Design a protein around this ligand. Sequence first.
Ligand SMILES: CCCCCCCCCCCCCCCCCC(=O)OC[C@H](COP(=O)(O)OCCN)OC(=O)CCCCCCCCCCCCCCCCC
Ligand code: SF4
Ligand code: SF4
Ligand code: SF4
Lengths: 144, 318, 115, 156, 45, 188, 178
Amino acid sequence: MELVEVLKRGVQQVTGHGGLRGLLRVFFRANDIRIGTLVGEDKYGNKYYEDNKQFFGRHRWVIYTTEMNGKNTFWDVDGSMVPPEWHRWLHCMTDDPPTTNPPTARKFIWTNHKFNVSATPEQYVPYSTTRKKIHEWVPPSTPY
Amino acid sequence: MFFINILTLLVPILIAMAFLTLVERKILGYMQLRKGPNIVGPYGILQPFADAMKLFMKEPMRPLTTSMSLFIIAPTLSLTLALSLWVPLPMPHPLINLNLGILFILATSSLSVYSILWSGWASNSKYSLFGALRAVAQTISYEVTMAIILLSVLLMNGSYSLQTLITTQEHMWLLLPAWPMAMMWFISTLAETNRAPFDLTEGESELVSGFNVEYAAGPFALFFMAEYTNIILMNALTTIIFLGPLYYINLPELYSTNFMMEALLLSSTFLWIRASYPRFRYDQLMHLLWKNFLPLTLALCMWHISLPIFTAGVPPYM
Amino acid sequence: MNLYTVIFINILLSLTLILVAFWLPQMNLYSEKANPYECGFDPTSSARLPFSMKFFLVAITFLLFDLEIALLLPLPWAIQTIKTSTMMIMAFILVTILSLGLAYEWTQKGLEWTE
Amino acid sequence: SRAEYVVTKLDDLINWARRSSLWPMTFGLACCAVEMMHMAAPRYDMDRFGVVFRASPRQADVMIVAGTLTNKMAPALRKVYDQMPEPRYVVSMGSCANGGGYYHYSYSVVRGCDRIVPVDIYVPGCPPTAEALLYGILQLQRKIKREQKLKIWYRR
Amino acid sequence: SKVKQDMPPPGGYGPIDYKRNLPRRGLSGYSMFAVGIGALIFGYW
Amino acid sequence: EVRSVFPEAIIIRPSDIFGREDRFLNHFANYRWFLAVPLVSLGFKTVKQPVYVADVSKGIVNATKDPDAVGKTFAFTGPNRYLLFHLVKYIFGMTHRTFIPYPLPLFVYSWIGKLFGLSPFEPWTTKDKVERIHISDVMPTDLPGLEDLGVQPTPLELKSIEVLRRHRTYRWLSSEIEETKPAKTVNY
Amino acid sequence: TYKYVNKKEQESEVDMKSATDNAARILMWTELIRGLGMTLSYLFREPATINYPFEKGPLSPRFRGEHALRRYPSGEERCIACKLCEAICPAQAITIEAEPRADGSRRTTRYDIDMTKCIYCGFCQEACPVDAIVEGPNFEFSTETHEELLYNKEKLLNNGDKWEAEIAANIQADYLYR
Ligand SMILES: CCCCCCCCCCCCCCCCCC(=O)OC[C@H](COP(=O)(O)OCCN)OC(=O)CCCCCCCCCCCCCCCCC
Ligand code: SF4
Ligand code: SF4
Ligand code: SF4
């Protein structure tokens, strides 16, 4: 019957993350067991699953890394870690991922994305990019 | 061993209050097209503990304009009465078998009013005083109907004991002879506990946390858990008096489980009612409960006086 | 001793919980948080002033109706008597008289609030 | 095992509690309060994270300065911040409150709520998307996660 | 090539509903009082 | 040792400072939780010349700009030398609670301070605190002070209510500065 | 035209049937069970919430968030110190100071944006005649200090070197509309 089909779907959700280890690693870390098609992995380890039968806010989702640039992100998960290759796809600006439609490569684009830095070092301290405008007189090193 | 029985009667009720919090939030959520807590635990089963620890680690407030004695002794009274009301509850065999159980209930609740009513005075603020006076009006509205409804209901029982209703409902619920009495008792239990649509004491958009605006920490936690314990209590009383579960002298655990089911349904109904309707105005409440419920309550008291007699259905004394 | 025991235990629970609430945390006391709330700005006056209530008559008649509750409440014991007719008529008289008084208050507009 | 380890774990526990149950205040002055509402709306439900509004400041653990702060409303904001009981946090929302915003050079505007209340996190925008304010809230959670209060108590 | 401007499709969009639609339901009132009074008399017996 | 290492230094020597979140006036006012206040020799044979925080702060903030004060010590004392009994009486009048003084030796009060200082948290009292409370303040007129640095010292009577209204109850919180029969000054 | 919202046509039709119907609207809370059933219906719907850091709300190529200064494919700096982005910026968030680069090129020695004054309006990116400054996609740069939101040339060039893979594509989508 119908109850049986939905319970079968629940069993598929329960048994589709490796084993109990991976099931818990996903459930206590994202609060969702939902299965989707692996669209493509990142160079850091993010997964970027997909399932189009869901409604238009849950048909794309990330499963973040456990270590991005030496931060131990098993729990301290944040949204800045999605590089721009996948920002466009995750926020549904396109239906074209970087596996099929990659971006134009340029010699100045960062190879290693950076998570948000606001409390650590490696953050942004502001300053004036200009120079001394008025130059003061340097007196002699001799008397008279 | 009585102390172990006190444990079994006390700590699960506190767990159940703490998880009624979660059930409230999640049912209001799903009635609001959203999901409640699912972050802190697997499905939010630790959010009550997080809330409690956060409250008991926040610094309290002893303001300067207040009366510290009432300020501190009122939450004590609130929790103590909310937790003492659960004591003579037959589920089916009670801890404290009293021959005047419902009188103890009524007196304990009418004293539970005084927690709110002294806290609001000791908190020397305008909003607290608004809330205390609103509670005065609320009690003046509902207590008359509570007493007379319960009188006319137990007029087919024969006693004020609560163990006797389990025998009065051996073959049938008291909901069928008295559904109107059950209706008005339900709304009375709703005005009691200061629950919606009759909140009228913590009236967020009228009284910004009335009778609690100066309470921050574990004191506020005490008021909160007292409310969420009296809710389960009143649902338990509804299902003991009206929705009588099955006794089966060999098996009392069947009574306990059916009582659990019915009280869960009635508490979920309380949350449903909160999510559905807006607040009354606290003069509309008095007018309603003096001009619609009290005449009908008196008339049905008359009817349930006549009814034992012209039916020859007078109940027994013990 | 059982009911006394239970109530003492609940009293102890509450007092221990309040001790915890007051002596566990860290405090930074000063007059700008110990002064009364009143929604951002300070009070123009005190809260310990006359608060004109407008259901005082309904409060008095609630007191009278509580006395009537007291008179009605012995019925679960009265009904087991042998007569069953004096009590029937007296309960009818009591309830009808109470309801007549309520109707008089209603018509003379005591249940209404002093606008 | 060791006293310092026990203290670190107790710190983790209390930080987890204060981090998972933070109760912001119904304090929304201008447009940014609408995005605050939309973060209370079903798509980005705050209550999922244990974040529920309490209209009283004394039942509040954080304030979100969502709107422009005038010279006439600053005393009230400061009275409310004082009335909040410690531990207490502030979150400045929008360019009007972080700095002056679109009214920095005007006569009745304080050029930053940070002139009046201390600020833990600044959420930029005009308005910020509710996802952005949610990022700010979770950043405040990350911040509470590393308090090390009982540690310094042990090391005093 | 010719222009492209996101116009409505040819033949207009479908018929949108805007009027109030609160459908009557329930019983006839007679029946509700009858069921209540029947349960009441049965419980009395 | 600071002179021995870093000369061309400034060494400020304030008296016991009072302020909103001090540990001097609040410390004497928190003696209401005990129903009587102990004082060595009933407060007499002890003299206190307290100073306000704003004065010391302005003094430091000017000394960091004064071309003088490079090898100078200072005595940030403030005016109106006070006798301890009268000072605590003024505290317990401005904080309108009550006043039950009584004598106490120094050895038992030292033991009290010790067992109070048996605390992992911030203690209420200590042996060194009692000792520092019950020795008089030096007549500071051998040294410059504030007015040699650009601050006119503030009397206690003008700023104490800001500190002490926190401790009042209702029935007295709405009371002014001019209803406390001020403390009796001494010179000695 | 118009139409009434709370005006009956008129009165004076009553029968025992209609009176019983209104009396069972009363005395049974008929019109309240409807709201109860409504809220119950909502209990059994898929909620619209999303696991935010993992699954995120939909945005568009036109979306304007963080700011960034761009380059040509040669890596050449694209701004030219024309200083109309500061002329029009209605919050006066942009200060610019320029010089010849010692290659003889028109370039800025300064480009600051107080991001606590920017109203995120996009006038600068639609006024820049070279598409140098844009308003990128990012909305997740909340900070613990005010000073971090006071940008300079280096932070903007870093935002450009970061988000060019996304900026270029969103521009690719969005031109022909501007
Ligand atoms: C055999 C012959 C003799 C038989 C004798 C018996 C005769 C039949 C007796 C029928 C009487 C039934 C009792 C009904 C009580 C309600 C009375 C009433 O009229 O409603 C009161 C109030 C009126 O509101 P208003 O629109 O202003 O109308 C008044 C106009 N002057 O309207 C309201 O009450 C609204 C306020 C309450 C809203 C609270 C929300 C409740 C939601 C429904 C909960 C349902 C669940 C109940 C479960 C309880 C089970 C224990
Ligand atoms: S920053 Fe913008 S959106 Fe926010 S309050 Fe100011 S004008 Fe409104
Ligand atoms: S988006 Fe508008 S307010 Fe922001 S920098 Fe550009 S022109 Fe100025
Ligand atoms: S960013 Fe663009 S508009 Fe602004 S000065 Fe440079 S070239 Fe001109």
